[PDB]
Amino acid sequence: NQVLVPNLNPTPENLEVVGDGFKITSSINLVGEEEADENAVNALREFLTANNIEINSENDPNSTTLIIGEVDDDIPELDEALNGTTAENLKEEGYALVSNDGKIAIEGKDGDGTFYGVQTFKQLVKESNIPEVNITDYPTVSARGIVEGFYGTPWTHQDRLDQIKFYGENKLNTYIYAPKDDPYHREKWREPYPESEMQRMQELINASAENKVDFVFGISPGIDIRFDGDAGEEDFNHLITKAESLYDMGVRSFAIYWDNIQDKSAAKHAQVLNRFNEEFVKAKGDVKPLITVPTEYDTGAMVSNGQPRAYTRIFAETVDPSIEVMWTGPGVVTNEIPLSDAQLISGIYDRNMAVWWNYPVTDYFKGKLALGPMHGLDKGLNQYVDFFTVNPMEHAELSKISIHTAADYSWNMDNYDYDKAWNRAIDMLYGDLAEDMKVFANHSTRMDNKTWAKSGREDAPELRAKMDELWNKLSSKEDASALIEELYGEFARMEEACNNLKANLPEVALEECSRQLDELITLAQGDKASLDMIVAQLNEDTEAYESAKEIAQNKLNTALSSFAVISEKVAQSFIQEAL
Amino acid sequence: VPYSS
Ligand SMILES: *[C@@H]1O[C@H](CO)[C@@H](O)[C@H](O)[C@H]1NC(C)=O
């Protein structure tokens, strides 16, 4: 009978079911494709082909009709199909979508908008069934996406192309190219890319345009750049030459980065930025605002007693208002960006800020996977932030979980529920394996190197609660056998899920997390022996206690010398507590 | 150092 609205990501701002839904016919009437966004139509064409829906040559009135276009197209048949709903009054990138009575209309506020309308369309359709809905939709934050700016092995060409498809499909519109260990990015920033790297860039730029992603070409010259006299000219001209050869392949966004360098010449940094902004960005006329990150880029390094440090004050005083400025929040890697930290930094800079969010990056603690949702970022952040990017792992595939939630948070910020988003991320990504992937991933959300880097939702918090309850019940001598049995089940379940993931994950995921799958299976076995210890102590069975103690020490020993790190404060720490 | 410390 009725067609339910499937999982959608991001969450559309306004959605109403207006009917029972309908099945889309074998072949459809497509209207508006001549004037509609070229990329939206290609996206739509691929989806139709992938789902064996043909486009009729000649209108057949017995077939589903799909109308598509932007506000600024003169197509009356579209305005008739929206039934008084419009994208005219929406912010840029917004769209309206209506399916009723065998018609699907999509109207983008602009081309980006029409492409995004197609994305939502694609998510709504299952086995030819679409619900009947009226949608108007638009992003909270106008720049949303990813900065590949981590240390360690950069993503491959194949990784990047696949990521860019993934951004498109989740309405992320920004990808900043800035890998720390690309030599031509940083170590040898003056040197041109060779012919073949330039060909790989071209493919990246093309795929970005195809997927409505702003490819941002970053460069980090702060290691050895000269600011004064003829050397300053020469080194500035090296920036221009480099940026120009990416402009010449189609790049329209640029970033100059000053993070993690010894030189703290604020004014000279800001002068390089302003000169480039005048001589390059504005001169070109079709280039987006310049992006930067200052040498002090977290609040702790930027601010001292409510008042900016020397560097920051001078940088902010000099850096042209049009330039986007990124900061990571209260620390490099931190639990939170409270609304007040944003207010503070946006105060000093006197502009809306850009966030460089260092999660799920794991270059500072490579043994663990960061597989949680966006967590700790205030839902009113849009008031001081208009540009949002996450720094992912050197593992592109598994970064997808966290990035999926980044798409939800930055598109529809105030509706964002990290737990619901996290569940949706895994459901949409893992299909048949979702429920198991959740069991595993649930243990791998918290990042903590025990010093400066701490971020993420806590590892399996419900399980910790039960573990904590068990210790309370034992020390106050209450009957724990209901909890005990419950706990055997959870540990068994961790083992069963992990063994199923190992057998069934496709290679692309499996090769990113197989060591951590072994780790969690190990720990689950040690948690089980840990309980066998508890029970033997209760039953005064020394034989059975010494025997479970050995097993529990043998699993803990394996985990402690593992490169893989998982569930430190939950599965791991339970064995330590029992010992 | 291959991280931000
Ligand atoms: C420092 O922090 C992260 C984590 O190590 C690193 O990936 C990044 O390149 C550095 N810069 C910023 C601005 O976070």
Coordinates of C-alpha atoms in Angstrom, one line a residue, chain A residues 151 260 297 363 452, chain B:
Chain A
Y151 CA 50.1 13.6 8.3
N260 CA 52.9 23.8 12.3
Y297 CA 44.9 28.0 15.1
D363 CA 47.6 10.6 12.5
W452 CA 46.8 16.8 24.2
Chain B
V1 CA 57.0 15.1 14.3
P2 CA 54.2 13.6 12.1
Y3 CA 51.3 15.2 14.0
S4 CA 50.3 18.6 15.7
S5 CA 52.3 18.8 19.0

